[PDB]
Amino acid sequence: ERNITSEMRESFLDYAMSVIVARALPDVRDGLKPVHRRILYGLNEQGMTPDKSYKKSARIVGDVMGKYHPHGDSSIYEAMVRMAQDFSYRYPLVDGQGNFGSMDGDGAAAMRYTEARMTKITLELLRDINKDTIDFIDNYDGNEREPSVLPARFPNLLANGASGIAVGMATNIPPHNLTELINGVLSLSKNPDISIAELMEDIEGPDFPTAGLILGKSGIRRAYETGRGSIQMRSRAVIEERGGGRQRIVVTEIPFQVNKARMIEKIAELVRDKKIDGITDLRDETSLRTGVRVVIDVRKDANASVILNNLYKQTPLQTSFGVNMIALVNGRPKLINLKEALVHYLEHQKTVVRRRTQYNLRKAKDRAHILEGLRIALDHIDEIISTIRESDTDKVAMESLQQRFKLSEKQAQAILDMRLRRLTGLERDKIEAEYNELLNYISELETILADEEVLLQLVRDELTEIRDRFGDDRRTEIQL
Amino acid sequence: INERNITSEMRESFLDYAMSVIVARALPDVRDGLKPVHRRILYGLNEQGMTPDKSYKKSARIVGDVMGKYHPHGDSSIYEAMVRMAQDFSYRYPLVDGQGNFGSMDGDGAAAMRYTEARMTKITLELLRDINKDTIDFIDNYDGNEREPSVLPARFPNLLANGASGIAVGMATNIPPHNLTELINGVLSLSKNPDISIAELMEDIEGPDFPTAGLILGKSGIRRAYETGRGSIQMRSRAVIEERGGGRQRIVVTEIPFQVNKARMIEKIAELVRDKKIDGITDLRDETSLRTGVRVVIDVRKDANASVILNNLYKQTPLQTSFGVNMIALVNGRPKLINLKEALVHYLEHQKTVVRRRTQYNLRKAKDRAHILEGLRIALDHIDEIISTIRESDTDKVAMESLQQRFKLSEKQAQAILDMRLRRLTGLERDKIEAEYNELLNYISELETILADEEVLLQLVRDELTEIRDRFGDDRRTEIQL
Amino acid sequence: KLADCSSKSPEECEIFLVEGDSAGGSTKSGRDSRTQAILPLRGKILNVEKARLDRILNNNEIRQMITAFGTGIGGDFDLAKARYHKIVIMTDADVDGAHIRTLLLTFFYRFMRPLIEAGYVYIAQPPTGYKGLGEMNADQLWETTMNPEHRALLQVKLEDAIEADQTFEMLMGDVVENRRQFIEDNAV
Amino acid sequence: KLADCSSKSPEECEIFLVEGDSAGGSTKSGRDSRTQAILPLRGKILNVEKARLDRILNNNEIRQMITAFGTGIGGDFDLAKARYHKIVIMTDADVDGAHIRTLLLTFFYRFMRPLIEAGYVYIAQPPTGYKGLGEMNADQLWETTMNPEHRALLQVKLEDAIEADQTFEMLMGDVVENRRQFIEDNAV
DNA sequence: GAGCGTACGGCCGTACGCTT
DNA sequence: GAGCGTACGGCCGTACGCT
Ligand SMILES: C[C@@H]1CN2c3ccc([N+](=O)[O-])cc3CC3(C(O)=NC(=O)N=C3O)[C@H]2[C@H](C)O1
Ligand SMILES: C[C@@H]1CN2c3ccc([N+](=O)[O-])cc3C[C@]3(C(=O)NC(=O)N=C3O)[C@H]2[C@H](C)O1
Ligand SMILES: [Mn+2]
Ligand SMILES: [Mn+2]
Ligand code: NA
Ligand code: NA
Ligand code: NA
């Protein structure tokens, strides 16, 4: 028998917990919810890199479902689709072919009807993942291994944003320009005690894929200061003058996460309900070549400026973005502001780059050890050979080679495994040349781990490379 | 604008569909006994190594690999086919090992594709046995991205063992399942006498052996179907008349005919009692559980004769059904109506050709290997001269010239020597190369014997067929009454 | 789509409320058709602590559960009109499975309280397993959780009506902040 | 099911009979909403050569086409009541697309013959390849088969009435054997 | 408000041949 | 007389937090 309060307390907590930290909230480090990371990682393990051809969605899902994500396919596929939509992601992470829906609320065609691969920027999220930069864990059945977090060589959380509903809390972080983010990470790295207001000298405010307008910097300020603010988003519209004293409103940019077709329905509802008037026609002329374009025709008598302003108020022609910056930090959720957001990220890069350099050291030294035994061997190759020849078994040659030429097991083994073609002159030089270079590389790697600024500067240097390859113009105009 | 004649369009289009459905959808190949879709589940299972010894993989995943790499059609046509291959009441010799709900005889569908698990059965290893040893031709897939086999080696005669029932265009096919132990004996008997008659082949193969057991009435239909390729076979449920106490009588059905929905059979009897077209029946229950198997109980009123009711149930419900044989298989890429012997002759021919190509492939690799070994023996006999020759060399390119020229070695042999490791110079290792070379000379001869004489190959085919017969052969299920 | 049992004696009968449409069908083939009925639950069920009565009584699922129990709800609830003397909650072994349990236990506590006091409400117990209930076949589903001899049913018992009353209010109620602080205090 | 165009001037209007719903969705976005109407075809249409008139006329897919053309069929067929001057058959570039296409042309020839004689019926010409229609995006789908300035249509012409009548009865009639012959005779 | 986004499948059309 | 077995999808419920 079970207590009804107890059963409720425990069981509900169980659900809640998991949803907070294995469903609806992104990590602060790579800016990803579990399903997103599992889709990118699966694309990786499948080798679905940009240079290879597309792969049908149903296969990608099928693998991602079975290997890491023990849930329905619709949650997986829709998530991926989103990542492919240039109107959802400021820096799309999936490169998809066929129908991946529109701003008009249009669904994407089912798994079978679309194919997909990873974008070039998705490579940067996965860079160095195989160089012990991040900790792995078991999957839900123990039969596979998967990452706890991706290296994330660009600030994903603030770049692409995050919006999910959890239990006890929700999150809502707007997308930003990448150039501005990085530059803001560079300023932070140079000055640990830098002010929010000073960081905004780089990071002006959000930057939605959908362009548009932001009214004033007050919301943005509060947002980045407290982690909670309200940001007004306004469509880009102009009133142009036409013959016989007529006018029309043309809307060329609409708010983030606003259904275009559904906004138009609302304008027409207000014309059938006569809650607004002066409007003669209403056309959606959105083409590939003009992009978005909604045209509103205005009755000669009416003032189109009045009409437009009433529309901002009465339809989602103007909408609010309610910033609630909650990410998983140390695996617990946390309201964070712009600085903690950047600070946990920078710290994530300092770890990734350390552990990598640390990894490249263990590998350099390990190789250099082997090359040394190979160099020895190459300087007495006559006696190395006869020594192996006098041996009955590989083990005796191993014993003999170690005792005679003061060699290690890894070194004796390496000499035994040596292919006679290495004895040709060119390969004999290659063995020396590799050693020498490797020594200077271990030098470089030991500089890095010994000085925190040399390391930090490395981080700066690589981040600036990303900036110069993927950084782009700002799309959203922030008005005062 | 261009103009297209409606008549011409109707002939050209409909011929494309018609032909496509025939040679590439609806009819099995006489060799491996598989439709295209089927082959591609099996191959897909195989290229993922979803062998019996490795745990079940999700149905979701399998279908995707098969659809994206080989079968550009909807997910359900692939899945349903895989689910049929996992049903012990559908396949005499199940080709798929499924876990979860894969449907029942009552005709209820298998649970969705995310709610099931699958891998091969041990017998399906035999359909794919020797596939990579240039035994079967490969062709490009639909997009050109992958490769897929045109047929499977099929080391057991599968067309006849599991049957076929596909509706095409302008034709259909319907082949019944058969017992393997009987089928292989028949093949053997044909291998020793090319002129064996059908009636003789029927000493080995009594007739079709359904996975559902039950009864076959008379051998008269089996011959017609086996001689001409068409004919009708009467299937009857196994039903006995139990007598409980003095008055009471019960009719218990334990086996029902093949491809006969049990729930729908039962309803028809419930229907006839309701419409008063059958008298005597008190209750009607389906006590089918896993341990008991199929059990359908009909309670009969006292003063009502069970036998009159039982016979009338045969004539009136699918408790007795006919199986309309129509043995049509793809033969040299064309559809063909084939009799039992043609079926068997084509399979044995497939088998001979598969073993001969296997042997040829093993010989090539064997002859190739011994060549390398020869060069390696030459090297180890003159080691110091060799080492000397390679060290003198500036590059590996000249090292080959200097070795080929000096010791009389092929390009191949100088590459093997330049790719040899210093651990090959120990004393024990020299012995291993001498050993490996000795057995290998003996193995090449064995193979060269097989290829020169038709009868050794013939026997080897027989010998390997007999291995399948023992390991996988089983007792007859379907009783044949006269 | 409820699948009901042959027997019309509530004392020996029992209804299984199962997660997902897949586990519904398997359960229906695996069941003792004489004493065992199944009401499949298409997904997440309404939180009744959050809705006003007019939605509740118009909620197809909540509708199908009342019709099945045959007892009416609230004050009009009649324990003698109960068609089943066992109501077993069968959900997946996973976290969402637990959610749908709480959701069910919320409806039961807030409209069919005397059903809990009379110890008719049971929770089934499938194996602790990454596998769902839908994934497992009919036989495994019957041999593990549905046959009286082998099954482990936790009879749901109520002890303190004032504690429980505030627990539901907190966990399932309108106020988020109180459910935030519960999470905070009790989560590790 | 049909998504009509804004224009009510038949001479400039055209309807597309598209295969499968996914392509029917993208064609609905890529189209020229002023002139071009989309009537999706969710699979294999009824073969009217094998159906009796009561089964034909109760058939939804068939019923939707008649309404959408608005000409009526049989002896009540008026070319002046037509809502589109171009009826375009747009199916996948595979054998099943070909089959649907034979099924449509059979319907038309048997019920709206003078609609073919007037040259109103057309066959679309999508891009050849393994990819079908539902796999193309709406824009590349508009450009390749729907845009009048770049598209290639096949206008269907009836040159010999007596010879065609014999062709439909063989290919699509209920006598199988004559079909078989034709296959075997032309099998390549 | 409602709807943002990760979670928890059934029903029922057609061709086609042979045979009931 | 109905059905066998490979082929050609979209409709819709709920929980959860926030303006
Ligand atoms: C298994 C599904 C079943 N299906 C159905 C089912 C019912 C109905 N029905 O209307 O009842 C129509 C269809 C048509 C179908 C589809 O769903 N979309 C499509 O465009 N092409 C198809 O073949 C077709 C689809 C391709 O395959
Ligand atoms: C994407 C689908 C949507 N879905 C729907 C959809 C509509 C309705 N509906 O009835 O409107 C109910 C459900 C419930 C769902 C689920 O969660 N559980 C289930 O057993 N079956 C399902 O289909 C649920 C399913 C698991 O996931
Ligand atoms: Mn579950
Ligand atoms: Mn197609
Ligand atoms: Na593992
Ligand atoms: Na507004
Ligand atoms: Na009969």
Numbering used by the authors:
A (entry chain C): 11 to 490
B (entry chain A): 9 to 490
C (entry chain D), D (entry chain B): 417 to 545, 580 to 638
What does the primary publication say about this deposited structure?
Bacteria have two well-conserved topo2As, DNA gyrase and topoisomerase IV (topo IV), which allow for dual targeting by antibacterials, affording reduced spontaneous resistance. DNA gyrase consists of two subunits, GyrA and GyrB, and functions as an A2B2 tetramer, as does topo IV, which consists of ParC and ParE subunits. Topo2As regulate DNA topology by creating a four base-pair-staggered double-stranded break (DSB) in one DNA duplex, passing another DNA duplex through this break and then resealing the break. As part of a structure-based approach to develop novel bacterial topo2A pharmacophores, we co-crystallized and determined structures of DNA-cleavage complexes of the S. aureus B27-A56(GKdel) fusion truncate (gyraseCORE) with QPT-1, etoposide and moxifloxacin.
With etoposide and moxifloxacin, we solved 2.80 and 2.95 Å DNA-cleavage complex structures in a P21 unit cell with two complexes in the asymmetric unit. With QPT-1, in addition to solving a 3.15-Å structure in this P21 cell, we also solved a 2.50-Å QPT-1 structure in a P61 cell with one complex in the asymmetric unit; the three QPT-1 complexes were similar but not identical (see bottom line of Table 1 (for nomenclature) and below). The three different QPT-1 cleavage complexes have the DNA gate closed in different ways. When the QPT-1-binding sites are compared, the largest difference is seen in the relative position of the G1 nucleotide, which is covalently attached to the catalytic tyrosine from the opposing subunit. All three Casym structures (both 2.8 Å etoposide complexes with two compounds bound and one of the 3.15 Å QPT-1 complexes) have angles between two subunits at DNA gate of 173.5±0.6° (compared with 179.4°–179.9° for CRsym structures) indicative of a ‘half-open' conformation at the DNA gate. The four cleavage complexes (two QPT-1 and two moxifloxacin complexes) not in the CRsym or Casym clusters have a range of configurations (angles between two subunits at DNA gate of 177.5–178.9°) intermediate between those of the two clusters. Similar to the fluoroquinolones, QPT-1 is bound between the +1 and −1 bases at the DNA cleavage site inhibiting DNA re-ligation. QPT-1 interacts with residues in the TOPRIM domain of GyrB, with the barbituric acid moiety of QPT-1 packing under Arg458 and making a hydrogen bond to the main-chain N–H of Asp437, and quite a close interaction with the main-chain CH2 of Gly436. Our observations of six QPT-1-related binding modes (from three QPT-1 cleavage complexes) show that, although the interaction of QPT-1 with the main-chain N–H of Asp437 is conserved, the interaction with the G1 base in more variable.
